[PDB]
Amino acid sequence: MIVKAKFVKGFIRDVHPYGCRREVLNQIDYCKKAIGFRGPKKVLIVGASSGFGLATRISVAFGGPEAHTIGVSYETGATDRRIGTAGWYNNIFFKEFAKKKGLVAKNFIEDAFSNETKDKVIKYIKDEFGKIDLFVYSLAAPRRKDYKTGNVYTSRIKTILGDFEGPTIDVERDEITLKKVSSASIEEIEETRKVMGGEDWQEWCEELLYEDCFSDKATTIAYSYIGSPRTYKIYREGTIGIAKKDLEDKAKLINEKLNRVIGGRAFVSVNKALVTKASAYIPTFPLYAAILYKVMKEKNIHENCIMQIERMFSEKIYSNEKIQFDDKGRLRMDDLELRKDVQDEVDRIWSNITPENFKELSDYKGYKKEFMNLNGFDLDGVDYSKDLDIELLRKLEP
Ligand SMILES: NC(=O)C1=CN([C@@H]2O[C@H](COP(=O)(O)OP(=O)(O)OC[C@H]3O[C@@H](n4cnc5c(N)ncnc54)[C@H](O)[C@@H]3O)[C@@H](O)[C@H]2O)C=CC1
Ligand code: NA
Secondary structure: OOOOOOEEOOEEOOOOHHHHHHHHHHHHHHHHHOOOOOOOOEEEEEOOOOHHHHHHHHHHHHOOOOOEEEEEEOOOOOOOOOOOOHHHHHHHHHHHHHHHOOOOEEEEEOOOOOHHHHHHHHHHHHHHHOOEEEEEEOOOOOEEEOOOOOOEEEOOOOEOOOOEEEEEEEOOOOEEEEEEEOEOOHHHHHHHHHHHOOHHHHHHHHHHHHOOOEEEEEEEEEEEOOOOHHHOOOOOOOHHHHHHHHHHHHHHHHHHHHHHHHOOEEEEEEOOOOOOHHHHOOOOHHHHHHHHHHHHHHOOOOOOHHHHHHHHHHHHHOOOOOOOOOOOOOEEOOOOOOOHHHHHHHHHHHHHOOOOOHHHHOOHHHHHHHHHHHOOOOOOOOOOOOOOOHHHHHOOOO
């Protein structure tokens, strides 16, 4: 079978599994070439299979600390109709590389919202892994199940106080298109807060702390976004923004408890805009990211996931220099994105953007490549003419 990049309902149908291997290896190679940092030895990451969580895992394992890692993710493998998710394969190839380096890399392919999943991970930590010094909560989900009551909360990306309509980039068609987003009901706001707020992160932290799973002075981090006024309507001041503010509020509560009990700490890191599976489908995000890429590349300050994470750990969290938070106690990795000259240029380009000129004014090429790359496509050192053995791929284990 020769896997080709193709779309179904605006989603890539089949990832290229060996491309995913190459993309994991590219991030590992960046970390191996980096100056290096030291700090964490035993790391738990929820949402470890792709995007920021995968970069987090690769950073601590290969960027100097030689950390053992537990990854919890929800992914699916090959069926008789589907090849498996990018994250499915990322987990597998990360493990292969980590094992060769002599590192523990445990995968739990499980729903993190489950009480059952928490018990499994806690059991593994107590029995086998040893206490955790770093816990990263990097989860992006469309829904949350409350396993006790059977209730399902659905995450919706909607606006508040007024419908939205604005340009976006359709990767399937290489075109600018208008996307409509409607106002959320109070129930929809609450459900999104239930899924993408800090409740589950807080529950993980409490269960970990109280079952004696954290090392003294342990750190926990969750990831957030603030962005520019170009996206306040559909992000920061929409349903997802209300959820992220709940996440930031929970960080403060978790921080107080961890500090009191083990001298530990919790904080949100507000990261920069970039292409991941989750972000690629936020309305209008492709257009903002494409312009931002253009501006930041011209100013030599562009970063992808692995560069973001490597800088965060080596320059801010585990540095010689003391960590600096914003006035709300958040770590700011959007420090370069939200720089005044960057945002001025983004706003200026944005105002000149049309369906006819967007490829000239924005870095659509770079945006599309990063989108293709995370799905295993458009990568160097991958032979895209070679047939893949499906039986071989389906036998691979996380
Ligand atoms: N990509 C961006 O522009 C930015 C993303 N962030 C935040 O980074 C965090 C991670 O998102 P990305 O890396 O962008 O997305 P991603 O789609 O690459 O990663 C999502 C991860 O969450 C896991 N996951 C989803 N439901 C799960 C479940 N029920 N149980 C266990 N794992 C589950 C997936 O398996 C995957 O590992 C999110 O909180 C997002 O809001 C923050 C700033 C920017
Ligand atoms: Na992630």
